[PDB]
């Protein structure tokens, strides 16, 4: 038993809710919140910009130190940093950005990072400003993640479309 509430169960291990991931993280304080990161951990907009703003820019300060030490992530890769006031940990995962021409097959590799964590709060990777089809992103998530994932979808219209079209 865990503290996530109001989710629709899609599969044995995947759950989904129309929710603002920032507000969900603050309420649940999950062990892991997933950030829709870029390779530079520049959290300017989308989910990343919102998460970082909620931490009063502490996420960005920590991230800049990480990059200065380690260099950029790979597309499809991840790193674990602090969750600040939102979670124990933040798993920063880089899905391919279609608006940069990155290979959509890297989406599966991105979701594989979720399997290193028993339970996660996450957005749909490569959705929103990353330019991928969220329905496809949900399918890859369901077909790749084996651990327990609670998906927060900000847009109500999109959430209803994801549920109604789910096979
Ligand atoms: O900006 C904020 N949040 C916020 C911003 C952006 C996103 C986001 O990229 N989602 C991904 C997404 C969907 C959705 O979630 O709609 S459908 C879909 C389909 C394919 C791929 C992805 C995808 C998520 C959350 N919050 C600040 C105002 C307080």
Coordinates of C-alpha atoms and ligand atoms in Angstrom, one line a residue:
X1 CA 0.0 0.0 0.0
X2 CA 1.2 3.5 -0.9
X3 CA -0.1 7.1 -0.6
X4 CA -1.0 7.8 -4.3
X5 CA -4.7 8.6 -4.6
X6 CA -7.3 9.0 -7.3
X7 CA -5.3 7.1 -10.0
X8 CA -6.8 5.0 -12.8
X9 CA -5.1 1.6 -13.1
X10 CA -3.9 0.8 -16.6
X11 CA -2.0 -2.4 -16.0
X12 CA -0.5 -4.4 -13.3
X13 CA 2.1 -1.7 -12.6
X14 CA 1.1 1.5 -14.4
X15 CA -1.3 4.1 -13.1
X16 CA -2.5 7.4 -14.4
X17 CA -4.1 10.6 -13.1
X18 CA -5.0 14.1 -14.4
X19 CA -2.7 16.1 -12.1
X20 CA -0.1 18.7 -11.8
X21 CA 3.1 16.8 -11.1
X22 CA 4.4 19.6 -8.9
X23 CA 1.2 19.6 -6.7
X24 CA 1.2 15.8 -6.6
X25 CA 4.9 15.7 -5.5
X26 CA 4.3 18.3 -2.8
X27 CA 1.4 16.3 -1.4
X28 CA 2.7 12.8 -1.8
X29 CA 6.5 13.4 -1.1
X30 CA 7.2 10.4 -3.2
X31 CA 10.5 8.6 -2.9
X32 CA 11.1 9.4 -6.5
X33 CA 9.8 12.1 -8.8
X34 CA 10.9 12.0 -12.5
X35 CA 12.0 15.1 -14.2
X36 CA 11.6 15.5 -18.0
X37 CA 15.2 16.7 -18.3
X38 CA 17.5 17.7 -21.1
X39 CA 21.2 16.7 -21.4
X40 CA 22.4 20.0 -19.9
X41 CA 19.9 19.8 -16.9
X42 CA 18.8 23.3 -18.0
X43 CA 15.3 23.3 -16.4
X44 CA 13.8 26.2 -18.4
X45 CA 10.3 25.1 -19.3
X46 CA 7.8 22.3 -19.4
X47 CA 7.8 19.9 -16.5
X48 CA 11.4 20.7 -15.7
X49 CA 10.8 24.4 -15.5
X50 CA 7.8 23.8 -13.3
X51 CA 9.6 21.4 -10.9
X52 CA 12.6 23.7 -10.6
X53 CA 10.5 26.8 -9.9
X54 CA 8.7 24.8 -7.1
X55 CA 12.2 24.2 -5.5
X56 CA 13.0 28.0 -5.6
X57 CA 15.8 27.2 -8.1
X58 CA 17.6 24.8 -5.8
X59 CA 17.2 22.1 -8.4
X60 CA 19.0 24.2 -11.0
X61 CA 21.8 25.1 -8.5
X62 CA 22.4 21.4 -7.7
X63 CA 22.1 20.5 -11.4
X64 CA 24.7 23.1 -12.5
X65 CA 27.2 21.6 -10.0
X66 CA 26.4 18.1 -11.4
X67 CA 27.1 19.1 -15.0
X68 CA 30.3 21.0 -14.0
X69 CA 31.6 17.8 -12.5
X70 CA 30.2 15.1 -14.8
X71 CA 29.4 16.8 -18.2
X72 CA 26.1 16.3 -20.0
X73 CA 23.8 13.3 -19.8
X74 CA 23.1 11.1 -22.8
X75 CA 19.8 11.3 -24.6
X76 CA 18.0 8.2 -23.2
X77 CA 20.0 8.5 -19.9
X78 CA 19.4 9.7 -16.4
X79 CA 20.9 10.7 -13.1
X80 CA 19.6 10.7 -9.5
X81 CA 19.8 14.0 -7.6
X82 CA 17.9 15.5 -4.6
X83 CA 14.1 15.8 -4.7
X84 CA 14.4 19.0 -2.6
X85 CA 11.0 19.9 -1.1
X86 CA 9.1 17.7 -3.7
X87 CA 10.4 14.1 -3.1
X88 CA 13.3 12.2 -1.5
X89 CA 15.0 11.9 -5.0
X90 CA 14.6 13.4 -8.4
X91 CA 15.3 11.0 -11.3
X92 CA 16.3 13.3 -14.2
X93 CA 15.5 11.4 -17.4
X94 CA 16.3 12.6 -20.9
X95 CA 13.7 11.6 -23.5
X96 CA 14.4 12.4 -27.1
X97 CA 13.3 15.9 -28.2
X98 CA 11.5 15.6 -31.5
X99 CA 11.9 19.3 -31.9
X100 CA 15.7 18.7 -32.0
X101 CA 15.5 15.7 -34.4
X102 CA 16.4 13.1 -31.9
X103 CA 15.6 9.4 -32.6
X104 CA 12.3 8.4 -31.1
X105 CA 13.6 4.9 -30.6
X106 CA 15.6 6.4 -27.7
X107 CA 12.3 6.8 -25.9
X108 CA 12.4 3.1 -24.8
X109 CA 16.0 3.5 -23.4
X110 CA 14.7 6.6 -21.5
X111 CA 11.9 4.6 -19.9
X112 CA 14.3 1.8 -18.9
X113 CA 15.8 4.1 -16.3
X114 CA 12.5 3.9 -14.4
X115 CA 13.1 0.1 -13.7
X116 CA 15.9 1.0 -11.3
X117 CA 13.2 2.4 -8.9
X118 CA 10.5 0.4 -7.3
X119 CA 7.9 3.2 -7.3
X120 CA 7.9 6.5 -9.2
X121 CA 5.9 9.6 -9.8
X122 CA 6.5 10.6 -13.4
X123 CA 5.4 12.6 -16.5
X124 CA 5.1 11.0 -19.9
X125 CA 8.6 11.1 -21.3
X126 CA 9.1 13.2 -24.5
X127 CA 5.5 14.6 -24.3
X128 CA 4.7 18.3 -24.1
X129 CA 7.4 20.5 -25.4
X130 CA 9.6 17.5 -26.3
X131 CA 7.3 17.0 -29.3
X132 CA 6.5 13.3 -29.2
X133 CA 3.0 11.8 -29.4
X134 CA 1.9 11.2 -25.8
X135 CA -0.2 8.2 -26.8
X136 CA 3.0 6.6 -28.2
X137 CA 4.8 7.7 -25.1
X138 CA 2.2 5.9 -22.9
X139 CA 2.5 2.7 -25.0
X140 CA 6.3 2.7 -24.7
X141 CA 5.9 3.3 -20.9
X142 CA 3.5 0.4 -20.5
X143 CA 5.6 -1.9 -22.6
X144 CA 9.0 -0.9 -21.0
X145 CA 8.5 0.0 -17.3
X146 CA 8.0 -3.0 -15.0
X147 CA 8.2 -1.1 -11.6
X148 CA 5.2 0.8 -10.2
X149 CA 4.7 4.1 -12.1
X150 CA 2.2 6.8 -11.2
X151 CA 1.8 9.0 -14.3
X152 CA 0.7 12.6 -13.8
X153 CA -0.8 14.2 -16.9
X154 CA -1.3 18.0 -16.6
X155 CA -3.8 18.5 -19.4
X156 CA -7.3 17.2 -18.7
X157 CA -8.2 16.9 -22.4
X158 CA -5.0 14.9 -23.0
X159 CA -5.6 12.7 -20.0
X160 CA -9.1 11.8 -21.2
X161 CA -7.7 11.0 -24.7
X162 CA -5.0 8.8 -23.2
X163 CA -7.5 6.8 -21.2
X164 CA -10.1 6.5 -23.9
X165 CA -7.6 5.3 -26.5
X166 CA -5.6 2.9 -24.2
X167 CA -5.4 -0.7 -25.5
Ligands
LIG1 O1 4.0 23.4 -16.4 C1 3.6 22.8 -15.5 N1 3.5 21.3 -15.6 C2 3.7 20.6 -16.8 C3 4.3 21.1 -18.0 C4 4.5 20.2 -19.1 C5 4.2 18.9 -19.0 C6 4.5 17.8 -20.0 O2 5.5 17.9 -20.7 N2 3.6 16.6 -20.0 C7 3.9 15.5 -21.0 C8 2.7 15.0 -21.8 C9 1.3 15.3 -21.5 C10 0.7 16.1 -20.4 O3 1.1 15.9 -19.2 O4 -0.2 16.9 -20.7 S1 0.4 14.5 -22.7 C11 1.7 13.7 -23.5 C12 1.7 12.9 -24.7 C13 3.0 12.5 -25.2 C14 4.2 12.9 -24.5 C15 4.1 13.7 -23.4 C16 2.9 14.1 -22.9 C17 3.7 18.4 -17.8 C18 3.5 19.2 -16.7 N3 3.3 23.3 -14.2 C19 3.4 24.7 -13.8 C20 2.2 25.6 -13.9 C21 2.7 25.1 -12.6

